[PDB]
C-alpha cells in the first residue's frame, strides 16, 4: 500500500501534465460523474426524503421549477409523496406539500428555521438596510407591530374615500380610460393595475405629499426600484450593471424623499394620524429602548409599499381577467352593489364593504386560484425531524412550503381549476382563526396553520397587510363594477401565470375591453 500511495502522487502529477483540451473536459465531466454517483448513494438513505434526480450539477431542477413549479410539484408528488427534496441553483430544497407541510414550515420553531437568512439578498438590496430581512427576527416582529398600528378599522374608515378618489381620478385622467371622453377602450391590465395600485396605496399609506410626488418624474424612480425586485437577486443581488445602479440610486432617492418629509414633519411638529408615516414617527421604539432611525423608517415604508404593490396589483389584474369571461359574475356583483349602496345613492364606506360578501368572495376565490407567492422558503438552522417519518432535514437545507399548490388540489377544493366565487358562501371572510390563538409580537393570530387555504401564510411571518389588501381591492373592484363592464377580445381567455417573476402575475399582454355602464356619466374635479 506504500507502493499504492506512491502511484497516487504519480497520478496527481500525470494529471497536471494533461493537454488542456482533456482537462477542461476533465474538470467538467468529473463533477458530472460524481454528482450522479452521489445521488445514487443518497437515494439509499432512509433518514432523508427522496431527492429529485437531476443531470446538471449545481443547476439542478432549477429550469423546470422556475417555469412550472406546480406541474413540477405534481409530478414529484405522484412519484415520491408529499415530502421530497430537489437541488436548485446550489441549494437543496425540501418540499412538504399539503396542510401537514403548512404546519411543518409555517409553525416551525424560531431556533429551527430562518426566513431572513433565505430572503436577505432578495429584499435588502431593494428596501435598504436595518429592516424586514436585514435584522434579527424580534426586530421584524416589532416592525410588523409598528405597521399594524396604522392598519386599524378607523384607519380603513378614513382610507376608503381616499382610495375611491384615486380610482375615479385614474378613470378620469389616465390615457388608459379617459371616461369623460371615451365610452369604450382596450387596456393591458398589467399596465393599469400596477399604476392604480401605487396611486391608491401611496395616497392612503404614505399620505398626500408622497401621492403628489407621483405626478412628477419622481414616479420614474419607483419603476427603477421595482426592477430590482427580481428573482435574479437570489443569485446576483449586486452586479456592476446599470440595472443595479438605477435600483440603488432609486432606493437612496426614494428613502431620501421619505426622510425629508419625516424630518420636515418633526421640524414643524406636524405629526397627527394621517398616514403610516405619522404612525411610524410616533410608534417606532423597540422593546429594548432603541428607536428606528429615519433611514430605517423610510426603508420599512419602501418594503411594505413595494411588497403590497406587487401582491395587490397582480391580484386585481387576475380579478379583472377572470371576470372578463364571466359576465354572470359581473352581473351578480353589480346587483350586490345596487342593493348594498341603495342604487348608488349611498356613499361607499368601510362598513358597507363588509356588507358585500360576493365581492369579498371574488377576492377570496382569486387568491385561491392565484396565490401571488407560489413558494415560501426558510433556511434550516438546526436538524429537523419530520414527524411520523424517519426523515431528518439537516441544517444548511432549505424547506419550501406552497399553500398555492394546495389551493389548486381537487381533494381540498372540488373542481379546483374552475373559478367559482360561490364555493365561499357563508365563508366570505379574508381568513379566520377558529381555534386557539398566539402572539409572536404583532398581535394574536391563529395557532394552527393546517388550513388548506393560506393566501396570507401563517406563523410568525404571517401577513399583516391582509385587511388593507381587502380594503384596497374591495374599494377598487366596487368602483370597477359600478362603473364598467368588460370582456375579452375575440378568441382570448384567461392567460397562464408567469411563475418566473417575483409574484405569479399574468402572462402579458393581458388585454380586456371595457365599456361604461353609463356612457353619459362624468367624473368631476380638475
Ligand atoms: C393580496 C395581497 C397579499 C397577499 C396574498 C400577501 C401574502 C403574504 C404571505 C403569504 C406572507 C407570508 C410570507 C412568509 O411566510 O414567508 C406575507 C407576509 C407579509 N406581508 Fe403580505 N400579502 C399581501 C399584501 C400585503 C400588503 C398590502 C402588505 C402591507 C400593507 C403586506 C405586508 C406583509 C408583511 C409586513 C409580511 C411579514 C413578512 C415576514 O414576517 O417575514 N402584504 N404576505
Ligand atoms: O414576502 C415578501 C417578499 N417575498 C417573498 N417571496 C416573494 N417576495 C412579499 N410580500 C408579501 N406580502 C407583500 N409582499 C415581502 C414581505 C414583507 C415585505 F415588507 C415586503 C415583501 F416583499
- Beta bridge pairs of residue 94: 85, 399
Distances (CA, A) of 187 to 110, 171, 196, 273, 486: 46, 12, 13, 37, 10
Distance CA 214, CA 234 (A): 30
Distance CA 445, CA 297 (A): 25
With respect to residue 511, please indicate whether it lies within any of the assigned structural domains: yes
* Pocket-testing residue among 131, 463, 464, 466, ligand 1, by greatest number of atoms within 8 A of Cβ: 463
Query: How many of the other CB atoms lie within 10 Å of CB of 342?
Result: 10
Query: How many of the other CB atoms lie within 10 Å of CB of 174?
Result: 16
Proximal ligand: closest to the CA of 440: 1
Q: What are phi and psi of 407, to 5 degrees?
A: -50, -30
With respect to residue 61, please indicate whether it lies within any of the assigned structural domains: no
Given its phi and psi angles, is residue 178 left (phi above 0), alpha (psi -120 to 50 degrees) or beta? left
CATH of the domain at 139: 1.10.630.10
Strands 113-114 and 376-380: antiparallel
- Indicate whether residue 118 lines ligand 2 (CB < 6 A): no
With respect to residue 366, please indicate whether it lies within any of the assigned structural domains: yes
Contact 86, 54 (CB under 8 A): yes
Give Cα 158 to chain centroid, integer Å: 26
With respect to residue 487, please indicate whether it lies within any of the assigned structural domains: yes
Contact 135, 115 (CB under 8 A): no
* Pocket-testing residue among 307, 458, 469, ligand 2, by greatest number of atoms within 8 A of Cβ: 307
Contact 171, 177 (CB under 8 A): yes
For residue 484, give its domain range. 121-516
Distances (CA, A) of 24 to 27, 29, 33, 35, 338: 5, 9, 14, 17, 72
Contact 359, 474 (CB under 8 A): yes
Contact 238, 125 (CB under 8 A): yes
Q: Atom 10 in ligand 2: which residue has the minimum CA distance?
A: 307
Rg (CA), the chain: 26
With respect to residue 259, please indicate whether it lies within any of the assigned structural domains: yes
Q: Distance, CA 225 to ligand 2 centroid (Å)?
A: 15
- Indicate whether residue 311 lines ligand 1 (CB < 6 A): yes
Nearest ligand 2 atom, CA 310? 14
Contact 312, 293 (CB under 8 A): no
Distance CA 431, CA 453 (A): 8
What 415-418 contacts at long range (C-beta under 8 Å, 24+ apart), as own/partner pairs, is 416/369, 417/369
Strand order in the sheet with 113-114: 83-88, 91-96, 398-401, 376-380, 113-114
Contact 118, 398 (CB under 8 A): yes
Distance CA 124, CA 409 (A): 34
What is the number of domains present in the chain?
Answer: 1
Q: Atom 19 in ligand 2: which residue has the minimum CA distance?
A: 304
With respect to residue 90, please indicate whether it lies within any of the assigned structural domains: no
- Indicate whether residue 115 lines ligand 1 (CB < 6 A): yes
SS3 per residue for 224-258: HHHHCCCHHHHCCCCCCCHHHHHHHHHHHHHHHHH
Give Cα 18 to chain centroid, integer Å: 51
For residue 73, give the nearest of 101, 114, 39 by alpha carbon.
Answer: 101
Dihedral sign (CA 324, 328, 332, 338): positive
With respect to residue 76, please indicate whether it lies within any of the assigned structural domains: no
With respect to residue 96, please indicate whether it lies within any of the assigned structural domains: no
Contact 70, 404 (CB under 8 A): yes
Contact 68, 375 (CB under 8 A): no
- Indicate whether residue 305 lines ligand 2 (CB < 6 A): no
CA angle 397, 401, 407 (to 5 degrees): 165
Distances (CA, A) of 493 to 188, 262, 334, 416, 488: 13, 46, 22, 18, 7
Helix (H) or strand (E) holding 378: strand 376-380
Distances (CA, A) of 480 to 192, 359, 517: 12, 11, 10
The grid coordinates listed for 315 are 391580484
Distance CA 346, CA 334 (A): 14
The grid coordinates listed for 312 are 395587490
Nearest ligand 1 atom, CA 314? 1
- Beta bridge pairs of residue 398: 93, 379
Experimental method: X-ray
The answer for residues whose C-beta is within 8 angstroms of residue 353's C-beta and 6 or more apart is: 160, 359, 360, 470, 471, 474, 475, 478
The answer for residues whose C-beta is within 8 angstroms of residue 419's C-beta and 6 or more apart is: 322, 326, 365, 366, 369
DSSP state of 30: H
State whether residue 430 is helix, strand or coil. Answer: coil
The answer for residues whose C-beta is within 8 angstroms of residue 13's C-beta and 6 or more apart is: none
Amino acid at each position: 500500500v506504500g507502493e499504492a500511495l506512491e502511484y497516487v502522487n504519480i497520478g496527481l502529477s500525470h494529471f497536471l501534465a494533461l493537454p488542456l483540451a482533456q482537462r477542461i473536459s476533465l474538470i467538467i465531466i468529473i463533477p458530472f460523474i460524481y454528482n450522479i454517483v452521489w445521488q445514487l448513494l443518497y437515494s439509499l438513505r432512509k433518514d432523508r426524503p427522496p431527492l429529485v434526480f437531476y443531470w446538471i450539477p449545481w443547476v439542478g431542477s432549477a429550469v423546470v421549477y422556475g417555469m412550472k413549479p406546480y406541474e413540477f410539484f405534481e409530478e414529484c408528488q405522484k412519484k415520491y409523496g408529499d415530502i421530497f427534496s430537489f437541488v436548485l441553483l446550489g441549494r437543496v430544497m425540501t418540499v412538504y406539500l399539503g396542510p401537514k407541510g403548512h404546519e411543518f414550515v409555517f409553525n416551525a420553531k424560531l431556533a429551527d428555521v430562518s426566513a431572513e437568512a433565505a430572503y436577505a439578498h432578495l429584499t435588502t438590496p431593494v428596501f435598504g438596510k436595518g429592516v424586514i430581512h436585514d435584522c434579527p427576527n424580534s426586530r421584524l416582529m416589532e416592525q410588523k407591530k409598528f405597521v399594524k398600528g396604522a392598519l386599524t378599522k378607523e384607519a380603513f374608515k378614513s382610507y376608503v374615500p381616499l382610495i375611491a378618489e384615486e380610482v375615479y381620478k385614474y378613470f378620469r385622467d389616465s390615457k388608459n380610460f379617459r371616461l369623460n371622453e371615451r365610452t369604450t377602450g382596450t387596456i393591458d391590465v398589467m399596465v393599469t393595475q400596477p399604476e392604480m395600485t401605487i396611486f391608491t396605496a401611496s395616497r392612503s399609506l404614505l399620505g398626500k405629499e408622497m401621492r403628489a410626488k407621483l405626478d412628477t418624474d419622481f414616479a420614474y424612480l419607483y419603476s427603477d426600484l421595482d426592477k430590482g425586485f427580481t428573482p435574479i437577486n437570489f443569485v446576483f443581488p449586486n452586479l456592476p450593471l446599470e440595472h443595479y445602479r438605477k435600483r440603488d440610486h432609486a432606493q437612496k432617492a426614494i428613502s431620501g424623499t421619505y426622510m425629508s418629509l419625516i424630518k420636515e414633519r418633526r421640524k414643524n411638529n406636524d405629526i397627527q394620524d394621517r398616514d403610516l408615516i405619522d404612525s411610524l414617527m410616533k410608534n417606532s421604539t423597540y422593546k429594548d429602548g432603541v428607536k428606528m432611525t429615519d433611514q430605517e423608517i423610510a426603508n420599512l415604508l419602501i418594503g411594505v409599499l413595494m411588497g403590497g404593490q406587487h401582491t395587490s396589483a397582480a391580484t386585481s389584474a387576475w380579478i379583472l381577467l377572470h371576470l372578463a369571461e364571466r359576465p354572470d359574475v359581473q352581473q351578480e356583483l353589480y346587483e350586490e352593489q345596487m342593493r348594498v349602496l341603495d342604487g348608488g345613492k349611498k356613499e361607499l364606506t368601510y362598513d358597507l364593504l363588509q356588507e358585500m360578501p360576493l365581492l369579498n368572495q371574488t377576492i377570496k376565490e382569486t387568491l385561491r386560484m392565484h396565490h401571488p407567492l407560489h413558494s415560501l422558503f426558510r433556511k434550516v438552522m438546526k436538524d429537523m425531524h419530520v414527524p411520523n417519518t424517519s426523515y431528518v432535514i439537516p441544517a444548511g437545507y432549505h424547506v419550501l412550503v406552497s399553500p398555492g399548490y394546495t389551493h389548486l388540489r381537487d381533494e381540498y377544493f372540488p373542481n379546483a381549476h374552475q373559478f367559482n366565487i360561490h364555493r365561499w358562501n357563508n365563508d366570505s371572510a379574508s381568513s379566520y382563526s377558529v381555534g386557539e390563538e398566539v402572539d409572536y409580537g404583532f398581535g394574536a393570530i391563529s395557532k394552527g396553520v393546517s388550513s388548506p387555504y393560506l393566501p396570507f401564510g401563517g406563523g410568525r411571518h404571517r401577513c399583516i397587510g391582509e385587511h388593507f389588501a381587502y380594503c384596497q381591492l374591495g374599494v377598487l373592484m366596487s368602483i370597477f363594477i359600478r362603473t364598467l363592464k368588460w370582456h375579452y377580445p375575440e378568441g382570448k381567455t384567461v392567460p397562464p401565470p408567469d411563475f418566473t417573476s417575483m409574484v405569479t402575475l399574468p402572462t402579458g399582454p393581458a388585454k380586456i375591453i371595457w365599456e361604461k355602464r353609463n356612457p353619459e356619466q362624468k367624473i368631476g374635479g380638475r
